[PDB]
Amino acid sequence: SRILAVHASPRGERSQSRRLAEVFLAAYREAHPQARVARREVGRVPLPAVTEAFVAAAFHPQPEQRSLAMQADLALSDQLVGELFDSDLLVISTPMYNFSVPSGLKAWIDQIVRLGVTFDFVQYRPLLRGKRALIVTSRGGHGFGPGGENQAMNHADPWLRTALGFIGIDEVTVVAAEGDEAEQRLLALARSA
Amino acid sequence: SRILAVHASPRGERSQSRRLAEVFLAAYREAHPQARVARREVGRVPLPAVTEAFVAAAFHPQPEQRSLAMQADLALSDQLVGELFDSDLLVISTPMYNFSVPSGLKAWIDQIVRLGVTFDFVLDVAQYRPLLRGKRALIVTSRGGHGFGPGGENQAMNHADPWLRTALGFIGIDEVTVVAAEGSFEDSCDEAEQRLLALARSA
Numbered sequence: 369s370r371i372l373a374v375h376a377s378p379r380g381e382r383s384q385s386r387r388l389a390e391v392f393l394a395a396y397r398e399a400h401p402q403a404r405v406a407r408r409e410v411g412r413v414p415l416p417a418v419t420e421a422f423v424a425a426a427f428h429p430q431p432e433q434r435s436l437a438m439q440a441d442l443a444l445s446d447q448l449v450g451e452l453f454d455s456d457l458l459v460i461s462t463p464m465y466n467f468s469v470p471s472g473l474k475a476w477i478d479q480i481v482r483l484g485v486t487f488d489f490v491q492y493r494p495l496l497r498g499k500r501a502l503i504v505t506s507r508g509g510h511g512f513g514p515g516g517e518n519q520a521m522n523h524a525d526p527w528l529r530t531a532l533g534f535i536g537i538d539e540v541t542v543v544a545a546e547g548d549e550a551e552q553r554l555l556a557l558a559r560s561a
Numbered sequence: 562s563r564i565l566a567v568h569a570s571p572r573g574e575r576s577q578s579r580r581l582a583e584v585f586l587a588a589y590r591e592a593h594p595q596a597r598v599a600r601r602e603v604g605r606v607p608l609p610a611v612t613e614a615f616v617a618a619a620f621h622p623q624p625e626q627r628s629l630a631m632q633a634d635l636a637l638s639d640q641l642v643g644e645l646f647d648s649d650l651l652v653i654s655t656p657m658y659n660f661s662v663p664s665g666l667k668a669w670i671d672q673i674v675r676l677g678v679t680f681d682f683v684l685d686v687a688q689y690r691p692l693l694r695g696k697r698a699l700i701v702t703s704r705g706g707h708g709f710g711p712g713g714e715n716q717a718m719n720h721a722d723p724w725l726r727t728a729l730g731f732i733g734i735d736e737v738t739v740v741a742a743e744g745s746f747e748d749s750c751d752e753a754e755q756r757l758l759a760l761a762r763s764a
C-alpha cells in the first residue's frame with residue numbers, strides 16, 4: 369500500500385523502462401486508490417557517489433558520536449533509506465547500460481546499503497523485512513533473461529537481486545522488455561499485488 | 562607500452578586497490594623508464610553519468626551533423642576514449658562496492674563505450690563488433706569479505722570484476738588479468754603485491 373518508485377533512466381518521455389513502470393503504477397493506483405506513491409529520481413538527476421567522507425561516517429565504530437559534519441555527509445543517505453523503510457513495495461525501473469545499470473542506480477544502492485541500518489554484521493544479516501520489489505527493465509538487445517543466449521552477460525537485474533537480497537528484499541519480480549507483452553504482464557501484476 | 566591507469570576508489574592513502582596498483586606502476590616504471598603513464602581519476606572525483614543528451618548525441622544517426630552543443634555533450638567522452646586509444650595497457654584499480662564497482666567506474670565505462678568509436682554494429686537484429694585492438698587490461702581489486710573469486714563460496718554474487726570483463730570485452734579488450742585481495746588480509750595483500758611485481762617485470 370506504500371510504494372517507492374525508483375526511476376533510473378536518464379530519459380524522460382522516451383524512456384521505455386519509465387513508461388512501463390508508470391503503467392504499473394497507474395494500474396496499481398486504480399486498484400488501490402488509497403495507496404501512496406513516492407518517486408525517487410536517480411536517472412534524470414545526479415546522485416552523488418560514495419566518498420571517503422561517506423565511508424568514514426557510515427562505518428564509524430561509534431555512530432552515536434558522529435559529528436554534525438558527518439551527519440551532513442550521511443543526510444541524503446538517511447533520506448534515501450527512510451523512503452525505503454516507509455515502503456511496502458519497491459518499484460525500480462531501469463535500462464540495461466553496458467551489461468549493468470546506469471551509474472545513478474548504482475549510486476542509489478551505494479547510499480542505501482548502510483551498516484546498522486539496512487544490514488548488520490556479527491557474518492552479515494539483513495535488516496529490512498516485509499518488502500517486495502518489482503524491477504522493470506528495458507534492454508536494447510535480446511537474450512539476457514533466464515535461459516537466454518546472453519544470460520551470463522546480465523549484470524543488471526541479477527546484480528540488483530543480490531544487493532536487494534543483502535538488505536532483506538528477497539521477494540523480487542523482474543519484468544523485461546528486449547529487442548506489448550510486458551505491459552500486459554504489468555497490468556496483471558497490478559491487479560493482484 | 563603506454564599505460565592508462567584508472568583509479569576507482571574514493572579513498573586515497575587508505576585505498577588498498579589504489580596502493581596495489583601504484584605498486585605495479587612504479588615497478589613497471591623501474592623496468593621501462595621511457596614508458597608513459599597516464600592517470601584517470603574516477604573515484605575521488607565525480608564523473609558525469611550518461612544523460613539523455615549524451616544518448617541523443619552518441620547515437621545520432623548522422624554524426625557529422627551534430628551541433629556544437631551536441632559535441633560539447635560528448636567532449637568528456639572523447640577525452641576519455643582518447644586516453645584509451647592512446648594506451649596499450651589499461652590498469653583499473655577498484656574496490657567491490659555492494660557486489661559491483663563504485664558508481665564512478667560505472668560512469669567511466671558508460672562514457673567509453675561509444676558507437677562508431679569503440680564498437681560498431683551491422684544489421685541482421687544488430688550484430689556488434691569491437692573496435693579496440695592490441696590492448697590488455699589489468700584489474701586490481703580489493704574486497705572486504707571473502708569468497709568472491711573463482712571457485713569461491715560467494716562467486717555468483719560477484720558483479721564487479723566479472724562484469725568489467727564482459728564490458729571491456731565488448732569493446733575489444735579480451736586479454737584481462739584480475740589480481741584480487743580479499744578479507745591475514747595483509748597476507749592476501751602481500752600475495753597480490755607479489756603477483757603484481759611479477760607481472761610488471763614481464764609486460
Ligand SMILES: Cc1cc2nc3c(=O)[nH]c(=O)nc-3n(C[C@H](O)[C@H](O)[C@H](O)COP(=O)(O)O)c2cc1C
Pocket residue numbers: 377378379382383384385386462463464465466467468506507508509510611616671
Ligand atoms: C549507454 C547505453 C548503453 C546501453 N547498453 C546496452 C546493453 O548493454 N545491452 C542492451 O541490450 N541494450 C543496451 N542499451 C540499449 C538500452 O538498454 C535500451 O535503449 C533501453 O530500452 C533503454 O531504456 P530506456 O528506454 O528506459 O531509457 C544501451 C543504451 C545506452 C544509451
Ligand SMILES: Cc1cc2nc3c(=O)[nH]c(=O)nc-3n(C[C@H](O)[C@H](O)[C@H](O)COP(=O)(O)O)c2cc1C
Pocket residue numbers: 418423478570571572575576577578579655656657658659660661703704705706707
Ligand atoms: C560503500 C561500500 C560498499 C562495500 N561493499 C562491499 C561488498 O559488496 N563486498 C565486499 O566484499 N566488500 C565491500 N566493501 C568493502 C570494500 O570492498 C573494502 O573495504 C575494499 O578493500 C575497499 O577498497 P579500497 O581499499 O581500495 O578503498 C564495501 C565498502 C564500502 C565502503
Ligand SMILES: CN(C)c1ccc(/N=N/c2ccccc2C(=O)O)cc1
Pocket residue numbers: 466467507508509616620689731
Ligand atoms: C551494449 N549494447 C549491446 C548496446 C548499446 C546500445 C544500444 N542501443 N542503444 C540505443 C540508443 C538510442 C536509442 C535506442 C537504443 C536501443 O535500444 O538499441 C544497444 C545495445
Ligand SMILES: CN(C)c1ccc(/N=N/c2ccccc2C(=O)O)cc1
Pocket residue numbers: 423427659660704705706744
Ligand atoms: C557488503 N559487504 C560484503 C561488505 C561491506 C563493507 C565492508 N567493509 N567495509 C569497510 C569500510 C571501511 C573500512 C574497511 C572496510 C573493510 O574492508 O571491511 C565489508 C563487507
